[PDB]
Design a protein around this ligand. Structure first.
Ligand SMILES: Cc1cc2nc3c(=O)[nH]c(=O)nc-3n(C[C@H](O)[C@H](O)[C@H](O)COP(=O)(O)OP(=O)(O)OC[C@H]3O[C@@H](n4cnc5c(N)ncnc54)[C@H](O)[C@@H]3O)c2cc1C
Ligand SMILES: Cc1cc2nc3c(=O)[nH]c(=O)nc-3n(C[C@H](O)[C@H](O)[C@H](O)COP(=O)(O)OP(=O)(O)OC[C@H]3O[C@@H](n4cnc5c(N)ncnc54)[C@H](O)[C@@H]3O)c2cc1C
Ligand SMILES: [Cl-]
Ligand SMILES: [Cl-]
Lengths: 415, 412
């Protein structure tokens, strides 16, 4: 036996793109390439489903901007994937609370040269105190902004990149699209191309440890039916995120970067009904940001509705799922009712629903000193590859950037 | 608050039947009952699938006998599950060694034994000749040293394909018509309607005694850490999963020692039933080559079933690539029927399943209780591996009666 020239652990968008660059290179003519992923389907945090077979939903990544994510758009085009307009870029009720924050973030703006290391909360509290800063930050519907490990300078960035709140900063001309059939369509297209150029996949295997071994490396993997397996290879990319790196045999992060990394969890839930009852309220294609636990509420045409939350509120919803389905559904009815200013009895019960919880939905770096796109083990020559090593940490575009640099460091290992 | 009065970990046939007996009991009125299992669906080593919209298949347990398993045959009827005749009760195309096989088994049966069946069967016959005839029976457990020659005659006599090699050719074999999934769903529906709550997809990592009750660590299959407090606790899991836990198994439970061996099944559907041309439907061939047992089910499909070292052989091919695995099957099919490879079609669809611990058993003649109790904490462990019927669903039912009785005791 079980052996290869090059091995990529991780069949997310980073690892699949790594494989695509390598196989396009003359200097790999004739080499063998093996790809492992601990899951049954490629994709990582890209996961499309069919909700009640009536419409495609995105349990993971769902949106991209041509302004922010041009390599991603070019990937969509190269693989003939249809894009559709993403509507949730405005509010039917931008509150004065929001436009106050627009006015207070621009007012406060010329201070981040000196103070931008402070937490975003500690920052905004300098305008109209702290109770007013909480009401303003909370109206943006992304509870990660309260975390002390989120600085003020990196908060202004977060706000400008997300489509619901991007007009609070002068980043409002950006456009947004979604895959018309599901982002899994792109994943399958790259996967087919890499397979047809001779790669071989072993989906369902988890890497456990790795030891350097002469000129190559010996990897210990475990199948999800318990079958133990050993693989030998001469060149190794780990296209996994930092949290998974930290639980391996290598010296991460000390011997790799120096910097420290964190992560926050994400939760999304979708509900279908027999009738599109929100059309009477003129809510199709709209998004509401509320202070109750659903945080962001989305109505998608005829088709369905969903909510999307993060950090402490993600953990809240996943506790309800653990206390039982009825009750989870029933607290959605309560909070939907108050978001619309009506009584629980006007909100029907769903036919079918789906949810997903990501223990490490988004992983980021906690510095910047100039951090490179992909990393290299100080001692063994293993290469790491993650969205979390780029300026686009938290976005698919970040995966494609790190893949290009990572696949270039390994090309020079090969000459 | 995340807690219960009673907790059962394991939603195989043992765990669900444990829950079924408890909710039937008057002494459990008022009390709360929570069932965990690490899989997303219930049934353990019972697993029914649909290969092609055509037919349902058994990735795990597939057959029972009314004579050998009266309680299982009774569960089927208590839940109104239709049965069907299991055809693979006869080796219609015997090989030379089959004929000698009945004769030597009745011939060696005097010798009192408890020794490894390979060394024994080669005591009164040539060693290279014993390998020839043991292997004609199609189950490579029979070559393991950890299996006595006593154990081996009990194995030959209870499997539908070689039972006529003993004076047991008169047992009947049945399969489920819609799959044993239908028996699992029946018990699950009952236990849920009496008010039990399922947390499927959670895996128990450890357990700690805590005052009068116990405190459980669980991990969801998406990472969510969980803690559950209960007062009474059944662990309806096999020994191999007892060993990976917080508790001192087996040292502090039985003082016996247990083993296991792995199993593999593979199913193939085609465009046209090419095997009828050989008068081969509803028939089973035992061959020497890696497929070890080849079954032909009417028009619908063929499969193969192997154990122990051959089970690892096939799981190996799978890890080297789906293609070529299919080509191994196609080479070995050709030698089994004695034709060239190019006459054997490739299949439309196929499914396989590998069971790292397919069957687990006890290594002793400890005249083995049906369920166990932890000397100190009062935790009860439930498994087919503790009974005379280990490796059979009937043992899960028997271990369940006992485990729920030891618990109903302690509740008063
Ligand atoms: C809720 C949510 C919403 C999102 N929304 C957006 C959005 O709208 N726009 C956008 O651009 N991005 C979004 N993202 C991010 C997007 O999912 C990208 O894929 C992500 O930024 C990085 O992809 P990746 O290939 O680097 O890593 P991953 O997709 O995380 O892939 C890593 C893979 O390696 C595998 N793996 C890990 N560890 C091991 C091991 N020890 N052995 C073997 N195999 C292993 C994993 O199974 C995984 O498949 C969202 C993410 C989440 C969770
Ligand atoms: C290939 C194969 C063929 C078979 N053919 C037959 C046959 O024809 N006739 C027959 O009678 N029997 C057959 N069997 C055996 C039959 O499947 C078993 O005897 C019976 O199902 C065992 O029931 P059980 O509840 O004791 O254990 P299991 O079926 O093993 O259920 C145990 C459950 O505990 C769960 N679990 C384990 N550990 C943990 C943990 N730490 N946390 C949470 N949950 C946990 C598991 O997910 C599992 O669901 C076959 C088995 C195999 C593998
Ligand atoms: Cl996002
Ligand atoms: Cl069996």
């Amino acid at each position: 036996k079980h052996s290869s020239d090059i091995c990529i652990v991780g069949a997310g968008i980073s690892g699949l793109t790594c494989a695509s660059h390598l196989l396009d290179s003359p200097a790999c003519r004739g080499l063998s390439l093996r790809i492992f992923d601990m899951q049954q389907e490629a994709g990582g945090r890209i996961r499309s489903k069919m909700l009640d077979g009536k419409a495609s939903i995105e349990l993971g990544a769902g949106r991209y901007s041509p302004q922010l994510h041009p390599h991603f758009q070019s990937a969509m085009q190269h693989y003939s994937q249809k894009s559709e307009v993403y509507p949730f870029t405005q509010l039917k009720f931008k509150s004065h609370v929001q436009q106050k924050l627009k006015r207070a973030m621009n007012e406060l703006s010329p201070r981040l040269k000196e103070h931008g290391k402070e937490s975003f909360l500690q920052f905004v509290s300098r305008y109209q105190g702290h109770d007013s800063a909480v009401g303003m930050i909370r109206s943006m519907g992304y509870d990660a902004l309260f975390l002390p490990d989120i600085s003020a300078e990196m908060a202004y960035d977060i706000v400008g990149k997300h489509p619901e709140i991007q007009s609070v900063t002068d980043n409002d001309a950006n456009q947004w699209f979604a895959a018309e059939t599901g982002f899994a369509g792109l994943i399958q297209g790259i996967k087919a191309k890499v397979k047809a150029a001779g790669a071989r996949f072993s989906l369902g295997y988890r890497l456990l440890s790795v030891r350097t071994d002469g000129d190559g490396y010996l990897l210990q993997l475990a199948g999800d039916d318990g079958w133990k397996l050993e693989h030998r290879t001469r060149h190794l990319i780990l296209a996994i995120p930092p949290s998974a790196m930290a639980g391996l045999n290598v010296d991460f992060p000390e011997a790799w970067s120096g910097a420290r990394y964190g992560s926050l969890p994400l939760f999304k839930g979708f509900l279908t009904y027999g009738e599109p009852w929100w059309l009477d309220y003129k809510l199709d294609d709209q998004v509401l940001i509320v202070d109750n636990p659903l945080r962001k509420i989305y109505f998608k045409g005829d088709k369905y509705l969903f909510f999307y939350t993060d950090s402490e509120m993600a953990n809240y919803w996943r506790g309800c799922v653990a206390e039982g389905e009825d009750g989870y559904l029933e607290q959605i009815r309560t909070h939907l009712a108050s978001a619309l200013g009506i009584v629980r009895e006007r909100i029907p019960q769903p036919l079918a629903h789906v949810h997903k919880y990501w223990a490490h939905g988004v992983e980021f770096c906690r510095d910047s000193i100039d951090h490179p796109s992909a990393l290299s083990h100080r001692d063994s020559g293993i290469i790491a590859c993650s969205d979390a090593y780029t300026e686009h940490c938290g976005w698919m575009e970040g995966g494609l950037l790190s893949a290009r640099e990572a696949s270039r460091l390994l090309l020079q290992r090969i000459a």
